[PDB]
Amino acid sequence: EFLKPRLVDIEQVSSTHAKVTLEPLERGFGHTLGNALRRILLSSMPGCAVTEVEIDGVLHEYSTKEGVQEDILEILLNLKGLAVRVQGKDEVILTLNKSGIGPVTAADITHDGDVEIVKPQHVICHLTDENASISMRIKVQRGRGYVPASTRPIGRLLVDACYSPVERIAYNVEAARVEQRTDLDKLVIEMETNGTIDPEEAIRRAATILAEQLEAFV
Amino acid sequence: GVLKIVKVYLAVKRRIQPGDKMAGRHGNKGVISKINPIEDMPYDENGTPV
Structure with a gap:
């Protein structure tokens, strides 16, 4: 009958992007599973993005802070691009104090030891003069x-x-010449995460979501 | 005839929506008709959507 595919390999190339392998697959199931998983991954994956920020001396995002060359709107954009993994909670308030x-x-x-920043080099802003200090509270929440x-409050900036x-998902169906049987497919899924999700x-x-959606008529 | 004037400056932020007219530099107009999901767009072999 239909051979059951299984996750045979996880080639983690870099921290951000990885390459998983599924083998074996029957004729046509390679593309079916590849596209279904690609759409599920690009659509529905839990993440830990930033939602609210609160800089102390800032009322609205269309203003400026002395000693910081970035505008507050650019700071909010840089925070919106922040990649962070929270594990034990849904919402958490990180604190940044820098002078x-x-x-x-x-x-x-x-640090907030249950919350891990995956890209410590991510520049948030620049402080120009020595006598300048910024203090902000960043609400990282799961969604x-x-x-x-x-x-x-009129001091809370929403991002x-x-x-x-995930940022980019690609799949390739190749011929898996294995098990002394030909005309079997192998699906290689190259995913480009921001580092906050393990490819496995x-x-x-993604497979769990498909299985749950198939319960409507089985 | 006027006693005092108070001027308030709102800062609206218009992102994008079906209806806004975008164009190019060669007379190619066009209003946005749909904001398609990321996974519905055509993609090349490397997975990058257009």
Whole structure:
């Protein structure tokens, strides 16, 4: 009958992007599973994006702070691009306090040991003069998809929520000459995450979503 | 005839929506008709959607 595919290999090339392998597959099932998984992964994957920010001396995002060359809107964009993995909670409030000349990157955030920053080199802003200090509270929360601030104190700045760990998914169906049987397919899935999702976990969640959606008529 | 004037400056932010007219530099107009999902767009062999 139909041979059951299984996750045979996880070639993690870099921190961001990885390459998983599924083998074996019958004729046609390679493309079916590849496209179904690609759509599920690009659509529905849990993420831990930033939702709200609170800089102390800032009222609205269309202003400027002395000693910081970035506008507050550019700071909010840089925070929106921040990749962070939270494990034991849904929402968490990271704290950033930085003074003195230099780049305020993501490594200056208070560790919050259950919350891991995956790209410490991510520059958030720049401090120009020594007597300048910034202090902000960043609300990193778990979610799915893309939730703009239009859908959901006068000192709280709301950023657009983009809880999608994956950035690019591709799949390739090749011939797996194995098990002394020809005309069998192997699906190689190259995914480009931001580092906050393990590729095996991503594939497992994608298959779980398909299995749950198929329960409507089986 | 006027006693005092108070001027308030709102800062709206217009993102994009079906209806907004985008164009190019060669007379190619066009209003956005749909904001397609990321996984519905055509993609090349490397997986990058257009």
